Structure 1
Amino acid sequence: VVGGTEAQRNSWPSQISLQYRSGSSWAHTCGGTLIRQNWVMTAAHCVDRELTFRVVVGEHNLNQNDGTEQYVGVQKIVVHPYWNTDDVAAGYDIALLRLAQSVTLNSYVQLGVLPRAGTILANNSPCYITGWGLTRTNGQLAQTLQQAYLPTVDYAICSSSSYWGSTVKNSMVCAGGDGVRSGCQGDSGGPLHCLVNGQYAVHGVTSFVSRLGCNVTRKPTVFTRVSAYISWINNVIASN
């Protein structure tokens, strides 16, 4: 997250860190959203590589003992069948991870609330991106979970020529684009939390930024639109 602020420990309890084994340690690669006690929602592209993955819930600081973490293996990966790793602009950048154990819920560990199917936010709708991604373009991962206020940019504006053009689809949410704040590498797969009728819901799964940089004016961060995938989500969980 470029131009973020450190999140309070209990603001975003559905946020997880998806990590891969890296020698005798684990490295954060992507975000995710706890949606069942044994199911995480993430970006398909976060799991294109043939790695050993684990999920950390109740995680705040990647580099320090928070006293609140639970560490769980990924037992099953279900990627959207239409996902194509060479065509992220096509969409479908969503995957569900079934965890080897059911996590315990507390104030640091909660299910992410999802929008109703079909829900599209009005332009300029208030949202936060959260994650441990780079704090600057070509930068380093955050230690502490960050958040950045990223208002939505509607499909008509986001798919206009000075924004993302044909690259953005109606199956996606755009947010931000102010040249100051954004998603960056390592935020992928994590939530866009948007405030709708008094309640935050996870409307976005972080998918991509410009190749030119994370915080590039009129290249808002693009998210897979959760509300387009409600039946797919339910269908996967119900059969797994």
Structure 2
Amino acid sequence: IVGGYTCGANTVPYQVSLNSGYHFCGGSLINSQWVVSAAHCYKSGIQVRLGEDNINVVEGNEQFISASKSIVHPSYNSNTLNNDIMLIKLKSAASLNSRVASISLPTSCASAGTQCLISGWGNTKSSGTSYPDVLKCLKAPILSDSSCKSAYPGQITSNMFCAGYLEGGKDSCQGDSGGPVVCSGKLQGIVSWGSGCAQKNKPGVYTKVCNYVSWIKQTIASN
């Protein structure tokens, strides 16, 4: 996250870190056994780390649980990042508490103008590289479809929305991918892509979760 703030330990209790020897992607806990992330985050050997603040120090609220199954969306296209969403089932159920908690799925889509909370352990510089150990947060509005399409001609599908600031300086970044965009207590986006980070006229592009709730629910009901 560029231009954000230190969330505070365990204040984003649905935030997960995906670990394959090192943090490489965010996710969101959506019930005791399932994590939503970005399909472009797919790899084998995933350990899900819940209850994290400092990803480099064992602080006492962590739960580390191996992935038993990953399911990338049936229609994911890695070239266009259309349908940039995947589900991860945990080998055992997380113990849900005040610091490890699921995030509600939306019943309706967010609209342009709604402020949202975006979080992750991604890069904090737009012209440089510095990775935080503790979780970083950013409050950002959804942008209109037209201004999203105008920022990225020929690239925005109906499964994508933009959020952030056209003026630059505040965005998600590399290593935030897969993580949450939460608006009024509902998971409305997944950190997906963008041209650099926090660049003028190049806001963050997010997977539009409301389009996938049917798929998420049916997948969870059969796996």
Question: Normalising TM by the smaller chain, what interval?
Answer: over 0.9
- State the Cα RMSD in Å: 1.2
Q: Which deviations, in whole Å up to 9, do the C-alpha atoms of 1:39-77 show, x marking residues without a partner? A: 000000000x4x311000000111112210000001100
Number of the residue aligned with 2:8 = 8
Equivalent residue runs for 1:1-240 within 5 Å:
1-20=1-20, 26-47=21-42, 49=43, 51-88=44-81, 91-116=82-107, 119-137=108-126, 138-160=128-150, 163-177=151-165, 178-195=167-184, 200-210=185-195, 213-240=196-223
Cα distance, 1:120 vs. partner? 3.1
Cα distance, 1:166 vs. partner? 2.1
- TM-score normalised per structure 1: 0.89
What amino acid does structure 2 have at the position aligned with 1:159?
A: K
Matched residue pairs, number? 221
Runs ≥4 residues deviating over 6 A: none
1:31 aligned counterpart, secondary structure: strand
What amino acid does structure 1 have at the position aligned with 2:58?
A: N
User: Identity, % of aligned pairs?
Assistant: 38
Deviates more, 1:165-174 or 1:63-72: 165-174
1:234 aligned counterpart, secondary structure: helix
2:19 aligned counterpart, secondary structure: strand
Q: Which runs of 5+ in 1 are unaligned?
A: 21-25
Q: Which runs of 5+ in 2 are unaligned?
A: none
Cα distance, 1:155 vs. partner? 1.0
